[PDB]
Every structure is written in structure tokens, then in C-alpha cells.
Amino acid sequence: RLIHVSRCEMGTSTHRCWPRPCDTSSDEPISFWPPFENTPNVIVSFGMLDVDNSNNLRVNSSADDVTVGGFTLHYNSWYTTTVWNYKLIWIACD
Amino acid sequence: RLIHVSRCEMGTSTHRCWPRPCDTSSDEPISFWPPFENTPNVIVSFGMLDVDNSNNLRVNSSADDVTVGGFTLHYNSWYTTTVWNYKLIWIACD
Amino acid sequence: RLIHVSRCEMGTSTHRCWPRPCDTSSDEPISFWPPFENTPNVIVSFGMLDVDNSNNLRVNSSADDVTVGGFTLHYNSWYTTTVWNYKLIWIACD
Amino acid sequence: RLIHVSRCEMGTSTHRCWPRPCDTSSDEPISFWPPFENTPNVIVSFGMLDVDNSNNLRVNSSADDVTVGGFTLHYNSWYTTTVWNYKLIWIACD
Amino acid sequence: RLIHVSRCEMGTSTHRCWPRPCDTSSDEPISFWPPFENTPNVIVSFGMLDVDNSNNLRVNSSADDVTVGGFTLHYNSWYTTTVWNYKLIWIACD
Amino acid sequence: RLIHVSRCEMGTSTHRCWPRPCDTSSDEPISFWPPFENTPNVIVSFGMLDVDNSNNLRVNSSADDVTVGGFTLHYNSWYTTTVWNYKLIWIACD
Ligand SMILES: *[C@@H]1O[C@H](CO)[C@@H](O[C@@H]2O[C@H](CO)[C@@H](O)[C@H](O)[C@H]2NC(C)=O)[C@H](O)[C@H]1NC(C)=O
Ligand SMILES: *[C@@H]1O[C@H](CO)[C@@H](O[C@@H]2O[C@H](CO)[C@@H](O)[C@H](O)[C@H]2NC(C)=O)[C@H](O)[C@H]1NC(C)=O
Ligand SMILES: *[C@@H]1O[C@H](CO)[C@@H](O[C@@H]2O[C@H](CO)[C@@H](O)[C@H](O)[C@H]2NC(C)=O)[C@H](O)[C@H]1NC(C)=O
Ligand SMILES: *[C@@H]1O[C@H](CO)[C@@H](O[C@@H]2O[C@H](CO)[C@@H](O)[C@H](O)[C@H]2NC(C)=O)[C@H](O)[C@H]1NC(C)=O
Ligand SMILES: *[C@@H]1O[C@H](CO)[C@@H](O[C@@H]2O[C@H](CO)[C@@H](O)[C@H](O)[C@H]2NC(C)=O)[C@H](O)[C@H]1NC(C)=O
Ligand SMILES: *[C@@H]1O[C@H](CO)[C@@H](O[C@@H]2O[C@H](CO)[C@@H](O)[C@H](O)[C@H]2NC(C)=O)[C@H](O)[C@H]1NC(C)=O
Ligand SMILES: CC(=O)N[C@@H]1[C@@H](O)[C@@H](O)[C@@H](CO)O[C@@H]1O
Ligand SMILES: CC(=O)N[C@@H]1[C@@H](O)[C@@H](O)[C@@H](CO)O[C@@H]1O
Ligand SMILES: CC(=O)N[C@@H]1[C@@H](O)[C@@H](O)[C@@H](CO)O[C@@H]1O
Ligand SMILES: CC(=O)N[C@@H]1[C@@H](O)[C@@H](O)[C@@H](CO)O[C@@H]1O
Ligand SMILES: CC(=O)N[C@@H]1[C@@H](O)[C@@H](O)[C@@H](CO)O[C@@H]1O
Ligand SMILES: CC(=O)N[C@@H]1[C@@H](O)[C@@H](O)[C@@H](CO)O[C@@H]1O
Ligand SMILES: [Cl-]
Ligand SMILES: [Cl-]
Ligand SMILES: [Cl-]
Ligand SMILES: [Cl-]
Ligand SMILES: [Cl-]
Ligand SMILES: [Cl-]
Ligand SMILES: [Cl-]
Ligand SMILES: [Cl-]
Ligand SMILES: [Cl-]
Ligand SMILES: [Cl-]
Ligand SMILES: [Cl-]
Ligand SMILES: [Cl-]
Ligand SMILES: [Cl-]
Ligand SMILES: [Cl-]
Ligand SMILES: [Cl-]
Ligand SMILES: [Cl-]
Ligand SMILES: [Cl-]
Ligand SMILES: [Cl-]
Numbered sequence A, B, C, D, E, F: 001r002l003i004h005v006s007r008c009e010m011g012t013s014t015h016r017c018w019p020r021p022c023d024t025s026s027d028e029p030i031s032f033w034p035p036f037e038n039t040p041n042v043i044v045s046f047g048m049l050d051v052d053n054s055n056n057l058r059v060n061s062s063a064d065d066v067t068v069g070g071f072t073l074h075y076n077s078w079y080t081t082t083v084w085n086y087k088l089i090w091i092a093c094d
């Protein structure tokens, strides 16, 4: 019979920067093994965050260039925001 | 044999408001196609956030009125909080 | 045939503390029923957050002691951070 | 993702008649527990057979009135055929 | 997680020949829709058989040229065997 | 969600004996690789049969000592029956 099921892979990426600020942007290659049968959807969020109150909080994350083989885990802050530590969490399911 | 498997659907909803503040609350209808066989559980978080440091950070998100056909993706801030941009991420699995 | 599928369980844990600050750390036992066939991966994030702007925002969450039977849902802030309310979201898939 | 999988149930029904001939026809109610999600296809054959050479061999089997709840396991010989023993085998998959 | 599951398709092919004998051999194209993801294994048997006792009983069946798209359902008797009616049953699973 | 799915393995075993009669009984060890997660059900039938009309047709087949690792594929005729060739077909699903 026809059914809908998903294969899900997930992970975290910790950036401990203090006593230095974290880089304004980061891109990390993530690989799926074995590759997915169909290109999965991927969502990204934050599991840990350390942001300076001296300026507004501006954080961004995304899954870029997603393929059955993997994707690029992306993060960036912008303008005057200062980020001291962060941990990205992500999950990919087809 | 009896096994436990999940069908998962996921997505994001970007609210680019700057140079205006984002609305205090938002509700967006999300549809599952085809509908789930059992009502799924849904969780929501933030993939991007831009909050003014002039006041405390207060952000809320939830999946309301969840059915096999879809749900209402909810967001709201409260009191003096000013949110300039945000991206909700959500995942529904049964 | 050999295929990759996941069983996913998910949930939320709301901590409404205002008018008192939330405890600096929290650990909650989460049980999977029935237990997973293989130990799942678990990721945790925030669905709601209320942080005082008087100090930097420092929030942390993790899934500790993960087994097929469950895990310990962990949260903590640190240093001068004051958290008034928060809701953890988590998802475990094998 | 969309995949094709089957739930299969199977069984046997032994008719030891010797020293008497087996009845010309037999119908046995078979129940599926729990019921199938979609009506399955069912095929029937013989795992054991004892037929007299005094006449031609004529044996028939079928799955009748198939539903998600079960079916009627049918057997019959015809004309001058004499059957002394037989075992039906069947398999139902959706 | 890695699991083993099968998609199974099955069917029957009835040859009512009496009052003429069935052809010594038969080959019928069977199509799978949609095609299998991996080439399946296929087995064939008899659900009904009518063989003359004037000579030995010799019946053969097989699944030939099996692909993800289908296979050739084969039957044949040989030498002096006379077959008056038969029904093939088959099941293909990956 | 809880669903019912099966892993199925199948095979055939050909005994070409002519010009000698096949042994009265045969037992062949069949191995499943990798082993099943739950003990499967197994059914056995005939895909090809060559029986002498000089005596009644008596053929038997069964799956004995079934475990997650395999089973013993069994066949036997009895009394005066003479079998010249046969092919067993079998399918195991959990
Ligand atoms: C968050 O990161 C994503 C990924 O880098 C950014 O997306 C880009 O947005 C620009 C325009 O805003 C587009 O031209 C690019 O094509 C997008 N890239 C991808 C891979 O989608 C996004 O702008 C970032 N958001 C913030 C607030 O920094
Ligand atoms: C976050 O959003 C949810 C959904 O709107 C809010 O939940 C409501 O909470 C009130 C009381 O606090 C209940 O009476 C409603 O029934 C709830 N609605 C639903 C659909 O569950 C929640 O209060 C919001 N949290 C914050 C801090 O704003
Ligand atoms: C977030 O919480 C996790 C879980 O308590 C912390 O992880 C511990 O980190 C220390 C060193 O930093 C290790 O010695 C422990 O073994 C870790 N525990 C576990 C269960 O992994 C983590 O340090 C916390 N992060 C922050 C910024 O507070
Ligand atoms: C084998 O058994 C099936 C099931 O009883 C018989 O099928 C019936 O066939 C007659 C006409 O031949 C139809 O009118 C009925 O509707 C059929 N019943 C069902 C449930 O399909 C079949 O005839 C038998 N074959 C032999 C050779 O005896
Ligand atoms: C049963 O049918 C199969 C399929 O036609 C026959 O298999 C062929 O056997 C010959 C030699 O015996 C081989 O050269 C062919 O390559 C086989 N064909 C295939 C597709 O496998 C088999 O011989 C038949 N058995 C009987 C007793 O008639
Ligand atoms: C068909 O083969 C099976 C398997 O050998 C036979 O089953 C045995 O039957 C006897 C009594 O008839 C029991 O004492 C044994 O325990 C059974 N063995 C198993 C493994 O179940 C069956 O008798 C045979 N049938 C014919 C007609 O020969
Ligand atoms: C150029 C630039 O980054 N501008 C940013 C804008 O994108 C928004 O984040 C705003 C409120 O925090 O702060 C600045 O104006
Ligand atoms: C009425 C109201 O919204 N009150 C809020 C309270 O809910 C909490 O967010 C607190 C700390 O940030 O700020 C205010 O007091
Ligand atoms: C000892 C301690 O907690 N130190 C913290 C450090 O970990 C980091 O959070 C920094 C920036 O916010 O604030 C403090 O220095
Ligand atoms: C009326 C009747 O049953 N006729 C049968 C016919 O169906 C077929 O089986 C034939 C050859 O064996 O034997 C008889 O003629
Ligand atoms: C040439 C030929 O078909 N020979 C057949 C042989 O294959 C076998 O079936 C035997 C016993 O029934 O009958 C004949 O001898
Ligand atoms: C002792 C023995 O094998 N007896 C068999 C009996 O089991 C049954 O097969 C019958 C009809 O064919 O033929 C013989 O009597
Ligand atoms: Cl950490
Ligand atoms: Cl420090
Ligand atoms: Cl996959
Ligand atoms: Cl600022
Ligand atoms: Cl954006
Ligand atoms: Cl700007
Ligand atoms: Cl579904
Ligand atoms: Cl405030
Ligand atoms: Cl709340
Ligand atoms: Cl208040
Ligand atoms: Cl499980
Ligand atoms: Cl501070
Ligand atoms: Cl028996
Ligand atoms: Cl006897
Ligand atoms: Cl089912
Ligand atoms: Cl006759
Ligand atoms: Cl018929
Ligand atoms: Cl007739």
C-alpha cells in the first residue's frame, strides 16, 4: 500500500567563542550518510545563544544548497549585534 | 510486524518587517497535503530573530488547532517588546 | 528491501515563572512509551522566551542521558542573565 | 516521502480426511486481527495434496469475500475426483 | 533507522480450457504499476489444476525476465501430460 | 505512528531427479540474512511437479524449525507415490 514515511537526520553545531565574539557568519558542510532517496527539507534553530545586550539581538540560520548528499549549515548575525556563543540545531527529513 | 514510523512535514515562515515593527501577533493557516493519517504533533521555534534591546525580549510561538488537515501557525510578542524581523520554523510528525 | 525510516516523538515544556525569575537550571525526566528500538537523536530549542534586557541573553538547552527509554530535558542560563518565562521544544527521532 | 509497503498475513489449513474422502467443497472463515488498513489481495494454493489416481485430478482454491476484516478460504474438487487429504496455504498482503 | 520492509504485488491467471486441452505452454506479460524501487523476487504456483490421469502429471511454472517493471508469467506441461484447466498464482516482493 | 508492515523473503528449490525418482523426503536448511527482527511465518507450495500416474499423488511440504535465522524446508511423499521432479516455492514474512 502507499504510505507516507520520513527518514530524519538531525544534529547540533556548537560555537563557543567567548572571550572573543563569534564570527559574523559561519557556513559548515553537513553530509548525509547514506544519501537520502529524495531531497529532504531541513530546518535550523538555536539550542543555545549568548547575545550582548549592548545592541539589538539579530540572529539568522538556514539550510542552504540542500541535496540528498547534505547541505550547508548557515548562520549569521548582522549590523551591531554581538554574539558570544551559540549552538545551532538542525533536522532534515524527507 | 508492528513498527513505529513517522511522517514528518516541516516548513518556515519569514516575517521581514524592518523598517516597521512586526505585528504583535500573527496567525497563518498551514495545510498538509495529503492529510495525515493520524493527527500529528507539531512544534514551533525561531530560525531568525531581530529584537530591540530597548525592552525585554518576549517571543512566543505555537501550533494551534492542529488536525490531520493542517494547523494554525501562531506567533506573538507581548508587553513592551519590539520585534523587527523573525522567521518561524515548524515540524509536524505523527 | 532496506529502507531508512524514523520514528519521531516530540514535546514541549512550559516554564511560566513571572513574577519570579525562572530557576537558573532545570532538568526534567522525559519518557518514551513504548521505548525506541534504537537510541534516538534528540534536539532541543525554545518555543517561547522572556529574557530581561538588563543583562546579556544567555540560554542553553540540551537532551542529556538519552536512551531508548527517554532522556533528561535540560535547560540553564548563566552569569547575570534573568529569564522570566520559557518554553522548551524537543524532538527525538531514530 | 511516499513509499510502497505491504502488511502480509499468511496461514495454512490442513484437512486430514483419510480413511474418508475429503468433502467436495469447504469454506472456512479467516479473520485478520487487527483489520487491514486497505483491503488486501489474497492468493491460495496447496501445501499438501493426496489425490486418487482412479480419476483425473481436479482441485480448486480461492479467497472469497475478501475484506479488511478477513475472507472465506475456499476449496473444492469437482466431477469424479477423489481427494483424501490436502493442506491449503494462503497469503494476504495489501 | 535501517529497517527491512517489502512491497508485495500478487495476482492470478485463470486458464479455462475444457473441453479443449490447455496449450502446452503459456507466457503472459505482467506489469507492475508503479514499477518497483528494487527488482523483486517472484514465485509462482497453482491455485487450481485439472490434469488427466491417463498420463503422468507434469506441470511447471516460473517468473521469467523479472524487472522492476514486470515479468513474464510462464507455464508449461511436457511429454504426454494433458491439462484441461489451471490457475496460476504469483507473488512478487522486494 | 503504529503501522503494520512485513519483510518478506522468498525462494525456490528445484529437485530434478528423472531418470531416477526423487527421494521420499528432503530437508534443506534455509538461512535468512540478515536475521528477521521477529520470527516470521513461512508457507511452502509447489512450483513444478512431476508425479507418476501409476499410483495416487501424495505430496507434502512444510517449513519446520522456523526462527529469525532461517528454517528447514521440508518435502515428502508417502506410500506408493512416485515423484520424478519437483520445485518447492516458499515465502517467509513477519
Ligand atoms: C539568513 O541567511 C540566508 C542564507 O544565507 C539569507 O538568504 C539570502 O537572502 C538574500 C536576500 O536577502 C538572497 O539574495 C539570497 O539568495 C539568500 N540566500 C539563500 C541561500 O537563500 C538571508 O538573507 C539571511 N537573513 C538575514 C536577516 O540575515
Ligand atoms: C503563546 O501562544 C499560545 C497560543 O495562542 C497561548 O496559549 C493560550 O494561553 C491562554 C492562557 O495563557 C489560554 O487561555 C489559551 O487557551 C491558549 N491558547 C491555545 C491555542 O493554547 C499562550 O498564552 C502564549 N504565551 C505567551 C507568553 O504569550
Ligand atoms: C548546556 O548544557 C549542557 C548539558 O548540561 C552542558 O554540557 C556540559 O558541559 C560541560 C563542560 O562545558 C561538560 O563537562 C559536561 O559533561 C556537559 N554535560 C553534558 C550532559 O553534555 C553545557 O556546558 C551547557 N552550556 C552552557 C553554555 O551552559
Ligand atoms: C473455484 O472456486 C471459485 C470460488 O467458489 C469459483 O468461482 C465461482 O465461479 C462461478 C462460475 O464459474 C461464478 O459464478 C462465481 O461468482 C464464482 N465465485 C466467486 C466467489 O468468485 C470457481 O468457479 C471454482 N473453479 C472450479 C474449477 O471449480
Ligand atoms: C520450467 O520453466 C522454466 C522457464 O521456462 C524452464 O527454465 C529453462 O530451463 C532451461 C533448461 O532446463 C534453461 O536452458 C532455460 O534458460 C530456462 N529458462 C529460464 C527463463 O530460466 C524450466 O526448464 C521448466 N521446467 C520444466 C520441467 O519444464
Ligand atoms: C508433512 O510434513 C510435516 C513436517 O515433517 C509433517 O508434520 C509432522 O506430523 C507428525 C504427525 O503427523 C507430527 O508428529 C510431527 O511433529 C510433525 N512435524 C512437524 C515439524 O510439524 C506432516 O505429518 C507431513 N504430512 C504428511 C501427509 O506427510
Ligand atoms: C543595515 C542593517 O543591518 N540594518 C539593521 C536592520 O536590518 C534591522 O536589524 C534593524 C533593527 O534591529 O537594525 C538595523 O537598522
Ligand atoms: C502584562 C505583561 O505583559 N507583563 C509582562 C510579564 O508578562 C513579563 O513578560 C515581564 C518580564 O519580561 O514583563 C511584563 O511585566
Ligand atoms: C563566568 C561567566 O558566566 N562568564 C560569562 C561568559 O560565559 C559569557 O556569557 C559572557 C558574555 O555574555 O558573559 C560572562 O562573561
Ligand atoms: C461436469 C464436469 O465436471 N466436467 C468435467 C470437466 O469440468 C473437466 O474437469 C473434465 C476434465 O477433467 O472432466 C469432466 O468432464
Ligand atoms: C522427454 C520427456 O519429456 N521425458 C519425460 C521426463 O522428463 C519425465 O517427466 C518422465 C516422468 O514423468 O516422463 C518422461 O520420460
Ligand atoms: C500408510 C499410508 O501411507 N496410507 C496411505 C494413506 O495415508 C492415504 O494416502 C491413502 C490414499 O492415497 O493411501 C494410503 O492408504
Ligand atoms: Cl555549550
Ligand atoms: Cl569568564
Ligand atoms: Cl533515505
Ligand atoms: Cl542596535
Ligand atoms: Cl531572512
Ligand atoms: Cl537599514
Ligand atoms: Cl500520512
Ligand atoms: Cl521591558
Ligand atoms: Cl505560554
Ligand atoms: Cl504582569
Ligand atoms: Cl521504535
Ligand atoms: Cl551581562
Ligand atoms: Cl499433514
Ligand atoms: Cl493407512
Ligand atoms: Cl494494516
Ligand atoms: Cl475422470
Ligand atoms: Cl476457475
Ligand atoms: Cl462438461
Ligand SMILES: [Cl-]
Binding pocket: D004, E007, E035, E036, E037, E038
Ligand atoms: Cl516500490
Ligand SMILES: [Cl-]
Binding pocket: E054, E055, E056, E080, E081
Ligand atoms: Cl506418462
Ligand SMILES: [Cl-]
Binding pocket: F014, F016, F048, F087
Ligand atoms: Cl525445472
Ligand SMILES: [Cl-]
Binding pocket: none
Ligand atoms: Cl527422457
Ligand SMILES: [Cl-]
Binding pocket: E004, F007, F035, F036, F037, F038
Ligand atoms: Cl527484519
Ligand SMILES: [Cl-]
Binding pocket: F054, F055, F056, F080, F081
Ligand atoms: Cl496408490
Ligand code: NA
Binding pocket: A015, A017, A021, A022, A023, A026
Ligand atoms: Na564562530
Ligand code: NA
Binding pocket: B015, B017, B021, B022, B023, B026
Ligand atoms: Na508581521
Ligand code: NA
Binding pocket: C015, C017, C021, C022, C023, C026
Ligand atoms: Na523554572
Ligand code: NA
Binding pocket: D015, D017, D021, D022, D023, D026
Ligand atoms: Na474436508
Ligand code: NA
Binding pocket: E015, E017, E021, E022, E023, E026
Ligand atoms: Na491455455
Ligand code: NA
Binding pocket: F015, F017, F021, F022, F023, F026
Ligand atoms: Na530428491
